[PDB]
Short mmCIF file of C-alpha atoms and ligand atoms in Angstrom, two decimals:
data_model
loop_
_atom_site.label_atom_id
_atom_site.label_comp_id
_atom_site.label_asym_id
_atom_site.label_seq_id
_atom_site.Cartn_x
_atom_site.Cartn_y
_atom_site.Cartn_z
CA UNK A 1 -27.61 4.33 -8.89
CA UNK A 2 -27.00 0.97 -7.22
CA UNK A 3 -23.31 1.83 -6.83
CA UNK A 4 -22.19 1.29 -3.24
CA UNK A 5 -21.26 4.52 -1.42
CA UNK A 6 -17.60 4.51 -0.40
CA UNK A 7 -16.01 6.32 2.55
CA UNK A 8 -12.22 6.65 2.46
CA UNK A 9 -10.03 7.61 5.41
CA UNK A 10 -6.61 8.97 4.48
CA UNK A 11 -7.91 9.66 0.99
CA UNK A 12 -5.44 12.53 0.55
CA UNK A 13 -2.60 10.12 1.23
CA UNK A 14 0.17 8.74 -0.95
CA UNK A 15 -1.84 5.63 -1.80
CA UNK A 16 -5.20 6.95 -0.63
CA UNK A 17 -5.48 9.52 -3.42
CA UNK A 18 -5.36 6.72 -6.00
CA UNK A 19 -8.24 5.00 -4.22
CA UNK A 20 -10.31 8.19 -4.25
CA UNK A 21 -9.60 8.70 -7.95
CA UNK A 22 -10.35 5.05 -8.74
CA UNK A 23 -13.61 5.18 -6.80
CA UNK A 24 -14.82 8.23 -8.72
CA UNK A 25 -13.68 6.78 -12.06
CA UNK A 26 -15.79 3.69 -11.35
CA UNK A 27 -18.83 5.85 -10.60
CA UNK A 28 -19.07 5.32 -6.83
CA UNK A 29 -20.40 8.11 -4.64
CA UNK A 30 -17.17 8.91 -2.78
CA UNK A 31 -16.72 10.44 0.67
CA UNK A 32 -13.28 11.64 1.76
CA UNK A 33 -12.58 12.18 5.46
CA UNK A 34 -9.79 14.70 6.08
CA UNK A 35 -8.43 16.69 9.05
CA UNK A 36 -9.48 20.35 9.38
CA UNK A 37 -5.81 21.42 9.33
CA UNK A 38 -4.62 19.25 6.43
CA UNK A 39 -2.30 20.90 3.91
CA UNK A 40 -3.82 18.82 1.10
CA UNK A 41 -6.06 21.79 0.19
CA UNK A 42 -5.32 21.83 -3.55
CA UNK A 43 -5.75 18.06 -3.71
CA UNK A 44 -9.12 18.27 -1.96
CA UNK A 45 -10.24 20.84 -4.52
CA UNK A 46 -9.29 18.35 -7.25
CA UNK A 47 -11.23 15.57 -5.52
CA UNK A 48 -14.20 17.91 -5.24
CA UNK A 49 -14.08 18.82 -8.93
CA UNK A 50 -14.13 15.08 -9.68
CA UNK A 51 -17.30 14.59 -7.65
CA UNK A 52 -15.99 13.63 -4.21
CA UNK A 53 -17.78 14.69 -1.03
CA UNK A 54 -15.30 16.21 1.40
CA UNK A 55 -15.88 15.70 5.12
CA UNK A 56 -13.55 17.54 7.48
CA UNK A 57 -13.09 16.14 10.95
CA UNK A 58 -10.94 14.32 13.49
CA UNK A 59 -10.97 10.59 14.21
CA UNK A 60 -11.77 11.53 17.82
CA UNK A 61 -15.21 12.77 16.78
CA UNK A 62 -17.02 9.51 17.52
CA UNK A 63 -20.53 10.87 16.99
CA UNK A 64 -19.59 12.45 13.66
CA UNK A 65 -18.06 9.15 12.53
CA UNK A 66 -21.16 7.14 13.42
CA UNK A 67 -23.51 9.54 11.63
CA UNK A 68 -21.22 9.41 8.59
CA UNK A 69 -21.05 5.60 8.62
CA UNK A 70 -24.85 5.44 8.49
CA UNK A 71 -24.77 7.17 5.09
CA UNK A 72 -22.28 4.84 3.37
CA UNK A 73 -21.83 1.15 2.53
CA UNK A 74 -18.09 0.52 2.23
CA UNK A 75 -15.23 1.87 4.35
CA UNK A 76 -11.60 1.87 3.23
CA UNK A 77 -8.75 3.04 5.42
CA UNK A 78 -5.47 4.23 3.93
CA UNK A 79 -4.05 5.71 7.14
CA UNK A 80 -0.29 5.70 7.77
CA UNK A 81 1.74 3.52 10.16
CA UNK A 82 1.65 6.02 13.05
CA UNK A 83 -2.16 5.87 12.95
CA UNK A 84 -2.67 2.10 12.66
CA UNK A 85 -4.20 1.59 16.10
CA UNK A 86 -6.20 4.80 15.66
CA UNK A 87 -8.24 2.69 13.25
CA UNK A 88 -9.98 1.32 16.34
CA UNK A 89 -11.84 4.64 16.31
CA UNK A 90 -13.06 3.84 12.81
CA UNK A 91 -13.92 0.27 13.82
CA UNK A 92 -15.90 1.45 16.86
CA UNK A 93 -18.03 3.71 14.66
CA UNK A 94 -18.52 0.88 12.15
CA UNK A 95 -19.78 -1.38 14.95
CA UNK A 96 -22.19 1.23 16.31
CA UNK A 97 -23.60 2.17 12.88
CA UNK A 98 -24.12 -1.49 11.96
CA UNK A 99 -24.82 -0.95 8.25
CA UNK A 100 -21.32 -1.27 6.80
CA UNK A 101 -21.07 -3.93 4.10
CA UNK A 102 -17.28 -4.11 3.78
CA UNK A 103 -14.26 -2.72 5.65
CA UNK A 104 -10.75 -2.65 4.20
CA UNK A 105 -8.19 -1.78 6.90
CA UNK A 106 -4.90 -0.11 6.05
CA UNK A 107 -2.76 -3.09 5.03
CA UNK A 108 -1.62 -2.54 1.43
CA UNK A 109 1.79 -4.19 1.76
CA UNK A 110 3.18 -7.54 2.88
CA UNK A 111 0.81 -10.32 3.97
CA UNK A 112 1.53 -9.94 7.69
CA UNK A 113 -0.39 -13.06 8.72
CA UNK A 114 2.08 -15.36 6.95
CA UNK A 115 5.41 -13.55 7.24
CA UNK A 116 7.60 -12.18 10.03
CA UNK A 117 10.22 -9.42 9.99
CA UNK A 118 13.01 -7.91 12.07
CA UNK A 119 11.84 -6.26 15.35
CA UNK A 120 11.60 -2.67 14.08
CA UNK A 121 9.16 -3.66 11.32
CA UNK A 122 7.64 -6.70 13.06
CA UNK A 123 6.32 -4.43 15.82
CA UNK A 124 4.56 -2.30 13.21
CA UNK A 125 2.90 -5.10 11.23
CA UNK A 126 1.77 -6.64 14.51
CA UNK A 127 -0.35 -3.49 14.89
CA UNK A 128 -1.99 -4.30 11.55
CA UNK A 129 -2.61 -7.87 12.75
CA UNK A 130 -4.30 -6.46 15.85
CA UNK A 131 -6.78 -4.62 13.63
CA UNK A 132 -7.51 -7.80 11.66
CA UNK A 133 -8.14 -9.83 14.81
CA UNK A 134 -10.57 -7.21 16.10
CA UNK A 135 -12.39 -7.16 12.76
CA UNK A 136 -12.78 -10.94 12.84
CA UNK A 137 -13.83 -10.99 16.49
CA UNK A 138 -16.63 -8.53 15.72
CA UNK A 139 -17.72 -10.37 12.57
CA UNK A 140 -17.23 -7.23 10.46
CA UNK A 141 -17.26 -8.06 6.71
CA UNK A 142 -13.78 -7.45 5.32
CA UNK A 143 -11.15 -7.70 2.63
CA UNK A 144 -7.45 -7.72 3.51
CA UNK A 145 -5.33 -6.34 0.67
CA UNK A 146 -1.69 -7.36 0.33
CA UNK A 147 -0.63 -4.93 -2.39
CA UNK A 148 3.04 -5.93 -2.20
CA UNK A 149 5.57 -3.19 -3.13
CA UNK A 150 4.39 0.26 -4.25
CA UNK A 151 6.21 0.44 -7.61
CA UNK A 152 6.83 4.15 -8.13
CA UNK A 153 7.85 4.37 -4.49
CA UNK A 154 10.46 1.61 -4.67
CA UNK A 155 11.69 2.21 -8.20
CA UNK A 156 12.51 5.70 -6.90
CA UNK A 157 14.06 4.26 -3.75
CA UNK A 158 16.17 1.55 -5.40
CA UNK A 159 17.16 3.27 -8.64
CA UNK A 160 17.09 6.94 -7.57
CA UNK A 161 16.41 7.72 -11.27
CA UNK A 162 16.60 11.46 -10.61
CA UNK A 163 20.22 11.00 -9.44
CA UNK A 164 23.08 11.23 -11.99
CA UNK A 165 25.35 9.07 -9.79
CA UNK A 166 27.37 6.24 -11.36
CA UNK A 167 26.79 3.71 -8.57
CA UNK A 168 23.72 1.89 -7.24
CA UNK A 169 23.23 0.28 -3.84
CA UNK A 170 22.17 -3.37 -3.76
CA UNK A 171 20.80 -4.80 -0.52
CA UNK A 172 22.08 -8.28 0.19
CA UNK A 173 22.90 -10.49 -2.80
CA UNK A 174 20.12 -8.80 -4.75
CA UNK A 175 18.80 -12.16 -5.93
CA UNK A 176 15.67 -12.15 -3.76
CA UNK A 177 12.44 -11.82 -5.72
CA UNK A 178 9.77 -9.22 -5.04
CA UNK A 179 6.50 -8.11 -6.61
CA UNK A 180 5.77 -4.43 -7.22
CA UNK A 181 2.63 -2.73 -8.49
CA UNK A 182 1.81 0.72 -9.88
CA UNK A 183 0.06 2.91 -7.30
CA UNK A 184 -2.66 3.94 -9.74
CA UNK A 185 -3.53 0.28 -10.32
CA UNK A 186 -3.40 -0.57 -6.62
CA UNK A 187 -5.97 2.18 -6.16
CA UNK A 188 -8.32 1.01 -8.92
CA UNK A 189 -8.15 -2.71 -8.09
CA UNK A 190 -8.74 -1.95 -4.41
CA UNK A 191 -12.07 -0.24 -5.17
CA UNK A 192 -13.03 -3.14 -7.44
CA UNK A 193 -12.40 -5.87 -4.89
CA UNK A 194 -14.13 -3.86 -2.16
CA UNK A 195 -17.51 -4.66 -3.74
CA UNK A 196 -16.61 -7.91 -5.51
CA UNK A 197 -18.31 -10.87 -3.75
CA UNK A 198 -15.29 -12.99 -4.65
CA UNK A 199 -13.26 -10.88 -2.22
CA UNK A 200 -15.71 -10.90 0.69
CA UNK A 201 -13.92 -11.96 3.89
CA UNK A 202 -10.78 -12.95 2.06
CA UNK A 203 -7.15 -12.04 1.66
CA UNK A 204 -6.56 -10.50 -1.78
CA UNK A 205 -2.97 -10.38 -3.03
CA UNK A 206 -1.70 -8.28 -5.93
CA UNK A 207 0.87 -10.46 -7.66
CA UNK A 208 0.67 -10.14 -11.45
CA UNK A 209 3.24 -12.41 -13.14
CA UNK A 210 4.61 -9.48 -15.16
CA UNK A 211 5.60 -7.65 -11.98
CA UNK A 212 7.98 -10.08 -10.25
CA UNK A 213 11.68 -9.23 -10.34
CA UNK A 214 14.95 -9.11 -8.37
CA UNK A 215 17.10 -6.06 -7.56
CA UNK A 216 19.76 -7.24 -10.01
CA UNK A 217 17.24 -7.76 -12.80
CA UNK A 218 15.61 -4.37 -12.19
CA UNK A 219 18.99 -2.66 -12.45
CA UNK A 220 19.89 -4.58 -15.63
CA UNK A 221 16.64 -3.62 -17.32
CA UNK A 222 16.97 0.03 -16.25
CA UNK A 223 20.52 0.19 -17.63
CA UNK A 224 19.21 -1.02 -20.99
CA UNK A 225 16.38 1.54 -20.94
CA UNK A 226 18.62 4.57 -20.36
CA UNK A 227 21.85 3.37 -21.96
CA UNK A 228 24.01 3.68 -18.86
CA UNK A 229 25.92 1.23 -16.69
CA UNK A 230 26.15 1.45 -12.90
CA UNK A 231 28.71 0.17 -10.40
CA UNK A 232 26.81 -2.12 -8.02
CA UNK A 233 27.68 -1.58 -4.35
CA UNK A 234 26.35 -4.33 -2.08
CA UNK A 235 25.44 -4.02 1.59
CA UNK A 236 25.83 -7.54 3.07
CA UNK A 237 22.80 -9.01 4.84
CA UNK A 238 24.58 -9.36 8.18
CA UNK A 239 25.36 -5.64 7.90
CA UNK A 240 21.73 -4.64 7.36
CA UNK A 241 20.73 -6.70 10.40
CA UNK A 242 23.25 -4.95 12.66
CA UNK A 243 21.87 -1.51 11.76
CA UNK A 244 18.36 -2.43 12.93
CA UNK A 245 19.80 -3.15 16.38
CA UNK A 246 21.90 0.01 16.73
CA UNK A 247 20.37 2.68 14.48
CA UNK A 248 17.61 4.21 16.60
CA UNK A 249 13.93 4.58 15.75
CA UNK A 250 12.55 5.63 13.29
CA UNK A 251 15.80 5.38 11.31
CA UNK A 252 16.04 1.59 11.73
CA UNK A 253 12.53 0.94 10.37
CA UNK A 254 13.27 1.61 6.67
CA UNK A 255 16.31 -0.66 7.01
CA UNK A 256 14.19 -3.43 8.53
CA UNK A 257 11.66 -3.00 5.72
CA UNK A 258 14.41 -3.24 3.09
CA UNK A 259 15.57 -6.50 4.67
CA UNK A 260 12.03 -7.88 4.63
CA UNK A 261 11.25 -6.93 1.03
CA UNK A 262 14.60 -7.30 -0.69
CA UNK A 263 16.69 -9.76 1.30
CA UNK A 264 14.16 -12.16 2.83
CA UNK A 265 11.95 -11.68 -0.24
CA UNK A 266 8.78 -11.63 1.87
CA UNK A 267 6.43 -10.72 -0.98
CA UNK A 268 7.49 -13.83 -2.91
CA UNK A 269 8.48 -16.30 -0.18
CA UNK A 270 5.15 -18.14 -0.10
CA UNK A 271 2.75 -20.08 -2.31
CA UNK A 272 -0.93 -19.16 -2.56
CA UNK A 273 -3.37 -20.75 -0.12
CA UNK A 274 -6.70 -22.34 -1.04
CA UNK A 275 -8.75 -19.29 -0.06
CA UNK A 276 -6.32 -16.62 -1.32
CA UNK A 277 -7.42 -14.45 -4.23
CA UNK A 278 -4.78 -13.09 -6.60
CA UNK A 279 -6.34 -9.94 -8.04
CA UNK A 280 -4.87 -9.90 -11.55
CA UNK A 281 -7.02 -12.96 -12.34
CA UNK A 282 -10.30 -11.23 -11.46
CA UNK A 283 -11.10 -8.78 -14.26
CA UNK A 284 -10.58 -9.63 -17.96
CA UNK A 285 -11.10 -5.97 -18.91
CA UNK A 286 -8.24 -4.80 -16.69
CA UNK A 287 -4.54 -5.50 -16.19
CA UNK A 288 -1.74 -4.25 -13.94
CA UNK A 289 0.81 -1.93 -15.53
CA UNK A 290 3.86 -4.16 -16.12
CA UNK A 291 7.43 -3.58 -14.99
CA UNK A 292 8.50 -2.72 -18.52
CA UNK A 293 5.67 -0.18 -18.81
CA UNK A 294 6.70 1.22 -15.43
CA UNK A 295 10.28 1.70 -16.56
CA UNK A 296 8.97 3.50 -19.66
CA UNK A 297 6.99 5.82 -17.39
CA UNK A 298 10.19 6.60 -15.49
CA UNK A 299 11.96 7.36 -18.76
CA UNK A 300 9.26 9.70 -20.13
CA UNK A 301 7.48 11.23 -17.13
CA UNK A 302 8.87 9.95 -13.80
CA UNK A 303 6.75 10.48 -10.67
CA UNK A 304 8.47 12.19 -7.69
CA UNK A 305 10.01 10.12 -4.86
CA UNK A 306 8.24 9.68 -1.53
CA UNK A 307 9.10 8.67 2.02
CA UNK A 308 6.55 6.95 4.25
CA UNK A 309 5.83 8.25 7.74
CA UNK A 310 7.05 6.24 10.74
N1 NDP B 1 3.49 -1.53 0.03
C1 NDP B 1 4.29 -0.45 0.04
O1 NDP B 1 5.27 -0.34 -0.69
C2 NDP B 1 3.95 0.67 1.00
C3 NDP B 1 2.87 0.57 1.88
N2 NDP B 1 2.43 1.68 2.57
C4 NDP B 1 1.16 1.52 3.31
O2 NDP B 1 0.07 2.22 2.71
C5 NDP B 1 -0.76 2.71 3.80
C6 NDP B 1 -0.87 4.21 3.71
O3 NDP B 1 0.44 4.81 3.70
P1 NDP B 1 0.68 6.25 3.07
O4 NDP B 1 -0.17 6.38 1.86
O5 NDP B 1 2.14 6.51 2.89
O6 NDP B 1 0.05 7.26 4.16
P2 NDP B 1 0.28 8.88 4.20
O7 NDP B 1 1.49 9.12 5.02
O8 NDP B 1 0.15 9.45 2.85
O9 NDP B 1 -0.94 9.29 5.15
C7 NDP B 1 -2.30 9.05 4.71
C8 NDP B 1 -3.15 10.12 5.33
O10 NDP B 1 -3.35 10.10 6.84
C9 NDP B 1 -3.85 11.34 7.34
N3 NDP B 1 -3.17 11.63 8.61
C10 NDP B 1 -1.83 11.93 8.79
N4 NDP B 1 -1.51 12.15 10.05
C11 NDP B 1 -2.68 11.99 10.72
C12 NDP B 1 -3.02 12.09 12.10
N5 NDP B 1 -2.10 12.41 13.02
N6 NDP B 1 -4.33 11.86 12.45
C13 NDP B 1 -5.26 11.54 11.51
N7 NDP B 1 -5.04 11.42 10.17
C14 NDP B 1 -3.73 11.66 9.85
C15 NDP B 1 -3.55 12.34 6.24
O11 NDP B 1 -4.73 12.82 5.64
P3 NDP B 1 -5.35 14.28 5.94
O12 NDP B 1 -4.22 15.28 5.87
O13 NDP B 1 -6.39 14.38 4.87
O14 NDP B 1 -5.96 14.19 7.33
C16 NDP B 1 -2.68 11.57 5.25
O15 NDP B 1 -2.81 12.04 3.92
C17 NDP B 1 -0.17 2.19 5.14
O16 NDP B 1 -0.83 1.02 5.59
C18 NDP B 1 1.26 1.98 4.74
O17 NDP B 1 1.87 1.05 5.61
C19 NDP B 1 3.05 2.93 2.41
C20 NDP B 1 4.23 3.02 1.66
C21 NDP B 1 4.71 1.88 0.98
#
């Protein structure tokens, strides 16, 4: 009906698939752009059975992109770090088509315009800032989503729940706060804000009050959930910093990210600005899965671990 048509790049991705599923659940005609040689064949079949329109192609196909843009209203990019500047290909098509009502670039993490990180990671988020500046320069309607930490991703990373080891690594003092959200919810809320006028040309942050915690508190709550105690092994902050200067790329990137999220506490180091929009306050019919509910999911049916591409 009146539902805006949504085009998603990287829809077969770790976070992208939750955006495709959320879009279809909400009744939006959904277009998924995917490479001709992608191995996400079974996933695409699932998307298709759910009503998605699959479009195979390369980002280098400028004409194809423009013709596709003319058929949709909203564009969401969930491309990975290695492809951040390749989003300029998407932006160029958006500009030529001229009918796009909202563009959401691939942010979905820290709020890069108000925080800084160690060189390995700083260089990467600067690429995301470059996309934002180009969007603003061209007056393209947008929504910048700071999703904070992907919960399943980092619960797996920090707790290694599938590992019967008796020790757990703690980065720094472990007292830094961070916010983490369930991937499925990040996907659903992202589709919602993409058409919500309250999110037009604004920074939307996902920071539900039930999802703020420290490494030490997460470990304590997990121990209670499974009835086991762990020996906490700390890696001093000055030690983490050294690694980012010697460990080569891409090995030093994850380390730099860990420092940003869990030592500097970048997702919780600032107060909201006048024009910021915290998403959990937007829809009374919805709510973010809480940390306790997340731990229950890991007890009953834990999702597999993942490693981002760098
Ligand atoms: N906040 C957090 O905790 C985290 C944030 N992130 C962020 O989420 C966003 C997406 O990350 P993530 O979901 O891990 O991305 P993925 O690594 O899952 O990649 C997304 C999609 O990109 C497409 N793709 C891969 N390589 C290429 C290429 N060479 N050319 C064109 N398309 C390509 C693939 O789709 P196909 O095969 O269909 O072409 C792929 O499924 C990023 O901005 C990332 O920084 C990610 C992890 C954690």
